[PDB]
Amino acid sequence: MTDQAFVTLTTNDAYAKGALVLGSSLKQHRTSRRLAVLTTPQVSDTMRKALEIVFDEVITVDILDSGDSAHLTLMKRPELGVTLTKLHCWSLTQYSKCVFMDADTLVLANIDDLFEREELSAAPDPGWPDCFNSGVFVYQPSVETYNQLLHVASEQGSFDGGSQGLLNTFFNSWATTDIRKHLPFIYNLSSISIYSYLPAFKAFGANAKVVHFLGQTKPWNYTYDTKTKSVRSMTHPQFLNVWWDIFTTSVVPLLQQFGL
Amino acid sequence: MTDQAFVTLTTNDAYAKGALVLGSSLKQHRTSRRLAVLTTPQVSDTMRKALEIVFDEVITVDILDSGDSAHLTLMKRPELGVTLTKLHCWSLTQYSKCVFMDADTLVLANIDDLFEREELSAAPDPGWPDCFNSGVFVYQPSVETYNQLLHVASEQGSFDGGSQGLLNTFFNSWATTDIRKHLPFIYNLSSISIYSYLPAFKAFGANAKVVHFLGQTKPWNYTYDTKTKSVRSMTHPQFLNVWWDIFTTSVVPLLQQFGL
């Protein structure tokens, strides 16, 4: 309850919108857990203040500062900045177990049952199914694990330049061990798969609990008509429209409170 | 040994070339099992005769005939012809366990260790990872199972119009049960994934044991230069070239034996 939480990250204002929609969706589906968000100094004061209302805890991380434990690793592999910032999710020892969710995900139903899972439970990644997708994962905060991950990042780096490569390298038994650590695909449904492998989507898509907006165009990069309640042209805009409905209904008016 | 086998299918002459390359690759990597191939009457006599040399057993299936057990189901769902023909792989009760492989697959290493698996072990399908790819699977021939599959095909059909939809519907516990039934992706490596999710391919691709040629363009649809030993333009033609090397070296000269 108080010791468990959903954790997300925002390094800029664009992703802060995503984090705000994600946090709202979790409240909408009545989670009994806490909501935490990692933020960097590049996130504006108004976005930070909005995050303080949606989330129960807002943690500031600045890997660009020499005082950060990941800074030295950053100097060595500067392209891993976002990854190293994300890894700080393991530093949240005030929680015994957490579900990390990228700011470009959207919750469509209560997913508190994820807390029944053990460290390193994640859904399979489309494209290369023997690697798990780093968009959503169950983990246990630990300084020791954090230090071990930073060590792998320092020595090996990430085979894909992101958190996905590093996490798969470290938690490498995932593909061949314990089916329970394979979170059902509907807990991290790739937006790409929805329009790509269509027959399967028509068959199992209605059970989607979490949508992961992948690709170059993020939800906030679309134009949304508030009258027709639909984004502008994409054979299944349903999810994009849910994201925008929450953004329009709960997030924007919240940000307006600060103009006064 | 004599009771176990690799089984493939060919409904026309184009796929017969694939089946011939596949069978040769299995012999090349010294399998200790038998090789069987299901063929239809539409496969020409010369291709059939070539198949009789590569494979230990050539079984004729004609679902268009009223005497076939799947014929009535075919009349009901005519678009499932290829699927129904493929299902006859379960009718091969002379074998206690088999590994079915589509004719558009290629073996790059001995995979006899697959016979350690139990009925319905298959690799995850890219696109929708909670469904297994029907390109390669471990199964146990059984009249009862065959009849049960035909019943599902009759009543429900296939959600994707192919064998993949029907097999996933019937063997539906795959995604959530027994990690051993999840065959490693390298035992059915999608050719699409090789050029699409590149970072992962560079990291794990060297361990590929089986390549599954997907997409509209099949290996035999490419132009191959015998001098440079490479297909004409595709950032990793390595596999296409292996397929063509076997075709050029073992299959074509074998087909030439029949001109005399």
Overview of this protein structure:
2 copies of one chain form a homodimer. With 260 residues, chain A is an alpha/beta fold. Chain A has one domain: Spore Coat Polysaccharide Biosynthesis Protein SpsA, Chain A (Alpha-Beta Complex), CATH 3.90.550.10. Chain A has 9 helices and 11 strands. In chain A, strands 3-2-1-4-7-6 form a 6-stranded mixed beta sheet, with helices on both faces. Chain A has a 3-stranded mixed beta sheet with strand order 5-9-8. Chain A has a two-stranded antiparallel sheet with strand order 10-11. Chain A is globular. The two termini of chain A are 35 Å apart. Chain A binds chain B through residues 123-131, 159-161, 165, 175-179, 182, 184-186, 193, 196-197, 199-204, and chain B through 123-131, 159-161, 165, 175-179, 182, 184-186, 193, 196-197, 199-204.
Features:
three-stranded mixed β-sheet, manganese ion binding (chains A, B), glycogen biosynthesis (chains A, B), homodimer, globular, EC 2.4.1.186 (chains A, B), alpha/beta, acetylation (chains A, B), nucleus (chains A, B), Spore Coat Polysaccharide Biosynthesis Protein SpsA, Chain A, 260 residues, six-stranded mixed β-sheet
Strand % of chain A is 15-25%
Helix content of chain A: 25-40%
> What is the CATH-assigned architecture of chain A?
Alpha-Beta Complex
Spatial shape of chain A:
globular
Give the CATH level 1 class of chain A.
Alpha Beta
Following the backbone from N to C, one meets helices and strands of chain A in this order, namely EHEHEHHEEEEHHEHHEEEH
**Most extensive contact:** A-B, 31 and 31 residues
CATH superfamily of chain A: Spore Coat Polysaccharide Biosynthesis Protein SpsA, Chain A
